[PDB]
Amino acid sequence: MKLLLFGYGNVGKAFRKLLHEKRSPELNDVIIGGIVTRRGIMLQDKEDFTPDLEGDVFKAFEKIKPDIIVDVSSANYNNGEPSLSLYKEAIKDGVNIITTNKAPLALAFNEIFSLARSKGVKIGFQGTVMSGTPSINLYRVLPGSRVIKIRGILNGTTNFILTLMNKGVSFEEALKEAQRRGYAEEDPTLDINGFDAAAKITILANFMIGNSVTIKDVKFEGINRDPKNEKIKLIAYADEKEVWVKPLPISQDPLYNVDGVENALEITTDIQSILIRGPGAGPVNAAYGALSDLILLKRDCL
Amino acid sequence: MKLLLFGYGNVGKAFRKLLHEKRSPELNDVIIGGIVTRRGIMLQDKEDFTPDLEGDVFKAFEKIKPDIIVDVSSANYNNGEPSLSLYKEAIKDGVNIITTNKAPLALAFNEIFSLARSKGVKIGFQGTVMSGTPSINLYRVLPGSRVIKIRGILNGTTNFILTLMNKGVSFEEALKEAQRRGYAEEDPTLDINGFDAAAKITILANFMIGNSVTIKDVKFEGINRDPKNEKIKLIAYADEKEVWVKPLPISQDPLYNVDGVENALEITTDIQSILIRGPGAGPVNAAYGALSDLILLKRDCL
Ligand SMILES: NC(=O)C1=CN([C@@H]2O[C@H](COP(=O)(O)OP(=O)(O)OC[C@H]3O[C@@H](n4cnc5c(N)ncnc54)[C@H](O)[C@@H]3O)[C@@H](O)[C@H]2O)C=C[C@@H]1SC[C@H](N)C(=O)O
Ligand SMILES: NC(=O)C1=CN([C@@H]2O[C@H](COP(=O)(O)OP(=O)(O)OC[C@H]3O[C@@H](n4cnc5c(N)ncnc54)[C@H](O)[C@@H]3O)[C@@H](O)[C@H]2O)C=C[C@@H]1SC[C@H](N)C(=O)O
């Protein structure tokens, strides 16, 4: 089983590390055929990236001819490219996809999944929501559950910022520490303006609720520079009717002690209501989400 | 695929109902070959139980010759019988097991699972811990996770009792309402003396941590008749060293607002710490745990 690793930022690097450390006994026939960044194409599995040739991800795809693409490249919410057209080509060629990049799915979920379904192609996408805390994969172990509504804190970066700000840390310093820890999107405004949280609730609305929705039609906003009296959280919500993201005051609520980089998800089904909580961001966490998807794919359980 | 339903109390009945209601599209070739209670053996799938013959579960097993046994019979913590010897016979004959009954696993986990592993037999046991709230199956979507420690509220009945008692309800009235709702073990003392919670932490220690442990060596105790000043919870805990159950005062703690029949589980791994919470007991909830295991077995994902 040959992987093409698309992206080698903090998640890509942590994924390669986790694969090597957790190789036995299920992942021995899984090889990284090649790694692609903006810098070019490495046709090796090495810790340090060195291009063997220049070329984009499509050249790398044609060269490596992989069984699976691991998409750990950065978000593009304008048109989802190049990931979007890459997913289309891969599915058409019967190549499986594991992604931590939310952009293609938040824009064209129903199209991507119907394309993959017709081809018998599998898509792992746990890393797109709450990183390594089962969300997508939590739903996989809730078969036959009819999801009525969902609510939660889905952005690690802004939650970490708000938490630090009440420990006497300035906005700019909080953001810089979030970036230092590698919590933030490459474009940190995607966290700040609520684009990232909006992408995640879109994905969840599509997958869990069955509401066919693009990020383009989701009403959302982010956090502020400003406080002190109440506890603010960025709340994402979806039911069969509405999908939104908005900062809100939270009463001394199940989402109240969800602090630092921690995220949480409340799922209401026909059967019951459940809540899961864990780290929402963190390169190792996100990479573990992708690794979980890989092991599950190996087990034929995606 | 032919099921033998062993037990037809509230869980058994809710399981049969859920199977019929969630039949499409994955479960159409799943039939209940027969149902066995203390009253005898019905060789039909009917809502109302009527014996077609007298005989125990072994007679029913020989008569039906099932692909899977669904064990929703009552707990026996003395020796785990008849379920224990039934599991042995079933595994030997290559028959899969789905159980909500904790007793055999809490007594002979390592033996049962090594027997099944050698035979390629699958065991679903989600319903044994936190009913329909992924616990066992949550771990299934955490592959490669090394579980360091676990802590939680694992008994629905006692948690419901404590909650009602602060709404001006007496112990006896709280217990009677727990029984009315069908939360309690057939022997309600199993809830009260902490046997049920102890069974669940034993199962989890075995499956998640890898600590080979029987309930016989777990130090445990239950709730009291007595309060008023603090919030008491029955806390179960396991790490690589110790396994225990004890009532404790809980500070205004992640397990603090876990009230009524709700249960919760804190899992600490090499990667991260996560918490899941949902109803811990409830016939429909437990039966859904078993149904989840059935769908996963159908998908070859147990
Ligand atoms: N960083 C994290 O912890 C998380 C990351 N995410 C996603 O994981 C993905 C990767 O993250 P990260 O490692 O930080 O990547 P980073 O953006 O730092 O680097 C992207 C990599 O892709 C390559 N690349 C980008 N565009 C390319 C193009 N057009 N052609 C060729 N190569 C290209 C770059 O060269 C680089 O190697 C992103 O899509 C994230 O959105 C997934 C789980 C989390 S959620 C984080 C969120 N900010 C929050 O606070 O909730
Ligand atoms: N009831 C619930 O909501 C839950 C049930 N559990 C387990 O599910 C199992 C069944 O529960 P329930 O429907 O209430 O069963 P119940 O005990 O009411 O009836 C048992 C059935 O098995 C049959 N049976 C028992 N022994 C037999 C024998 N030797 N030969 C032939 N037939 C026999 C009986 O005739 C009867 O039909 C039990 O093992 C429970 O421990 C699983 C999830 C929950 S956890 C509940 C726990 N008390 C708590 O508060 O946390």
Burial label, A76 (beta-carbon count in 10 A; 0-12, 13-18, 19+): middle
Please answer yes or no on whether B134 and A141 come within 8 Å at the CB atom. Answer: yes
Residue type, B7: G
Alpha carbon A15 to its chain's center = 13
Query: Residues near ligand 1 with C-beta < 6 Å?
Result: A 7-12, 36-38, 56-57, 72-75, 82, 100-102, 127, 131, 155-157, 182-186, 191, 196, 280-283, 286
Q: In angstroms, rounded to a whole number, what is the distance separating the alpha carbons of residues B158 and B189? A: 10
Alpha-carbon Rg for chain A, nearest whole angstrom, is 19
The CATH H-level superfamily of A1-143+279-302 is NAD(P)-binding Rossmann-like Domain (3.40.50.720)
For residue B136, give the DSSP letter: H
SS3 letters across chain A: CEEEEECCCHHHHHHHHHHHHCCCCCCCCCEEEEEEECCEEECCCCCCCCCCECCCHHHHHHHHCCCEEEECCCCCCCCCCCHHHHHHHHHHCCCEEEECCCHHHHHHHHHHHHHHHHHCCCEECHHHCCCCCCCHHHHHCCCCCCEEEEEEECCHHHHHHHHHHCCCCCHHHHHHHHHHHCCCCCCCHHHHCCHHHHHHHHHHHHHHHCCCCCHHHCEECCCCCCCCCCCEEEEEEEECCCEEEEEEECCCCCCCCCCCCEEEEEEEECCCEEEEEEECCCHHHHHHHHHHHHHHHHCCCC
- Residues with their C more than 2.5 Å from the N of the next written residue in chain A, i.e. before a break, are 226, 252
What separation in angstroms does the CA of B98 have from each of B6, B101, B122, B128, B169? 10, 9, 8, 10, 37
Are B208 and B147 in contact by the 8 Å Cβ rule? The answer is: yes
B142/A292 touch (CB, cutoff 8 Å), yes or no: yes
Q: Which two tokens stand for residue A142?
A: 């809730």
The residues spanned by each domain of chain A are: 1-143+279-302, 144-278
Residue for token pair 């509401």: A211
Contact status of B250 with chain A (Cβ, < 8 Å): no
B70 vs B7: CA distance, rounded Å: 8
**CA–CA distance, B234 with B281 (Å, rounded to integer):** 15
User: What does residue A140 show for φ and ψ, rounded to 5 degrees?
Assistant: -55, -35
- Residue found by looking up tokens 């002190």 in the block: A228
Angle value at C-alpha B196, between B194 and B75, nearest 5 degrees:
135
In CATH, what is the architecture of B144-278? Answer: 2-Layer Sandwich (3.30)
Chain B residues within an 8 Å CB radius of A18: 144
Using DSSP bridges, classify how beta strands A232-239 and A147-153 pair: parallel, antiparallel or unpaired.
antiparallel
A39 CA: nearest ligand 1 atom: 35
How many degrees, rounded to 5, is the angle at CA A246 between CA A243 and CA A251? 115
Helix (H) or strand (E) holding B227: none
Q: What are phi and psi of B71, to 5 degrees?
A: -95, 100
**CB atoms inside a 10 Å sphere around CB A250:** 17
Strands B243-249 and B232-239: antiparallel
Q: What's CA A262's distance to the chain center, in Å? A: 15
Measured from CB, residues less than 6 Å from any atom of ligand 2 are B 7-12, 36-38, 56-57, 72-75, 82, 100-102, 127, 131, 155-157, 182-186, 191, 196, 280-283, 286
Which method was used? X-ray
CB A235 within 8 A of CB A247: yes
Beta bridge partners of B37: B40
* C-alpha distances in Å from residue B58, one per residue of B12, B36, B80, B87, B292: 18, 10, 15, 11, 26
Closest CA to B155 of B176, B136, B183: B183
Beta carbons of A217 and A229 less than 8 angstroms apart: no
CA distances from B47 to A293, B6, B12, B253 (A): 40, 15, 10, 44
Integer Cα distance of A268 and A272 in angstroms = 6
CA of A40 to the centre of ligand 1 (A): 16
**Which residues are within 8 A (CB) of A115 and not within 5 positions of it... i.e. 6 or more apart?**
A88, A91, A92, A121
Take residue A236 and report the two structure tokens written for it. Answer: 């994402």
Query: CB contact, 8 Å: B284 with chain A?
Result: yes
Residues linked to residue A98 through DSSP beta bridges, in sequence order: A70, A124
Kindly state the tokens that stand for A12.
Answer: 């890509």
Distance in angstroms (rounded) separating the CA atoms of residues B289 and B207:
17
Strand pairing category for B147-153 and B262-269? antiparallel
Residues of chain B with Cβ-Cβ distance to A22 below 8 Å are 144
Token pair, residue B261, equals 């029949």
Question: Do A262 and A277 meet the contact criterion of CB atoms below 8 Å apart?
Answer: yes
For chain A, the distance separating the N- and C-terminal CA atoms, rounded to the nearest angstrom, is: 16
Which residue numbers in chain B precede an interruption (C–N > 2.5 Å)?
Answer: 226, 252
Instruction: Identify whether the C-beta of residue A70 lies closer than 8 Å to the C-beta of residue A46.
Output: no
Q: Cβ neighbours of residue B193 under 8 Å, at least 6 residues apart?
A: B221, B222
Size of interface A-B (CB pairs under 8 A): 96
- Residue B222, both tokens: 């239950």
**B147-153, strands of its sheet edge to edge:** A219-220, A243-249, A232-239, A147-153, A262-269, A273-279, B273-279, B262-269, B147-153, B232-239, B243-249, B219-220
* Rg (alpha carbons) of chain B, rounded to whole number: 19
